[PDB]
Amino acid sequence: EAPDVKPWLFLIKPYEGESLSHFLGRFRRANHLSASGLGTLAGIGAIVARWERFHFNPRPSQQELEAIASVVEVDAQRLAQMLPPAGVGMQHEPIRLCGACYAESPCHRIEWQYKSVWKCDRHQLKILAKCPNCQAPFKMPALWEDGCCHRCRMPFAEMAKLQK
């Protein structure tokens, strides 16, 4: 062993509005974990691959968030802030993006999936629901490694000027 070392893992700081799908994707990339791997590591199994698609029948339970809060050092109350608050309706399929936010903070925001959200009040821009250059839909936020459209390679920060 390395003497006086504590068993450790690569951590990531969650951004102020980062979605759980985006967060788990970064944590998985930081540790080169497959989606099945993190679920086995937390012991919740295939559930992680389901959450990364925003498939929330059922929602992330107290048990499973506290389980993920054992391998991720982020506490379960902060993990619950990566999800819609109680009774806020959300949509999983059309993945959406502000772009002007992504130039400031490279994360998907869970509020971009709310059924009540359509503009960024900070930027006063209509949030995108597909790539404005090539019309390809955005991939699940767990897969936003490159920070660009997977088809035409336009960076999300440039898509800010193609909004509203």
Partner DNA sequence: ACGACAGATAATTTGTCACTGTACACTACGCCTTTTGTGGAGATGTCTAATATCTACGTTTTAACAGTGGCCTTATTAAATGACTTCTCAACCTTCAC
Indicate the residue among 55 and 151 with the shorter CB distance to Zn ion.
Answer: 151
| Residues in 105-164 at the binding interface with Zn ion, rule: CB under 5 A | 120, 122-123, 131, 133-134, 136, 149, 151-152
The verdict on 65 binding Zn ion (CB under 5 A) reads no
**Ramachandran sector of residue 128 (left: φ over 0; alpha: ψ -120 to 50; beta: rest):** beta
Q: Which does 116 bind (CB under 5 to 8 A by kind): Zn ion, DNA, none?
A: none
User: What angle in degrees, to the nearest 10, is found between the helix axes of 35-42 and 20-30?
Assistant: 90
Find the helix or strand (DSSP H, E) in which 120 lies: strand 119-120
Indicate the residue among 46 and 136 with the shorter CB distance to Zn ion.
Answer: 136
Q: Which does 12 bind (CB under 5 to 8 A by kind): Zn ion, DNA, none?
A: none
Q: Which does 79 bind (CB under 5 to 8 A by kind): Zn ion, DNA, none?
A: none
Binding-site ranges for DNA (CB under 7 A): 33-37, 40, 46, 49-50, 53, 55, 57-58
- Residue 107 marked ligand-binding: no
DSSP β-bridge partners for residue 74:
none
Residue type for position 93: E
DSSP β-bridge partners for residue 121:
none
132/134 Cα distance (integer angstroms): 6
Q: What are the distances in angstroms from CA 80 to CA 18, 83, 86, 107, 122?
A: 11, 5, 10, 17, 23
Binding site for Zn ion (CB under 5 A): 98, 100-101, 120, 122-123, 131, 133-134, 136, 149, 151-152
Residues tagged in the binding site annotation for Zn(2+)? 98, 101, 120, 123, 131, 134, 149, 152
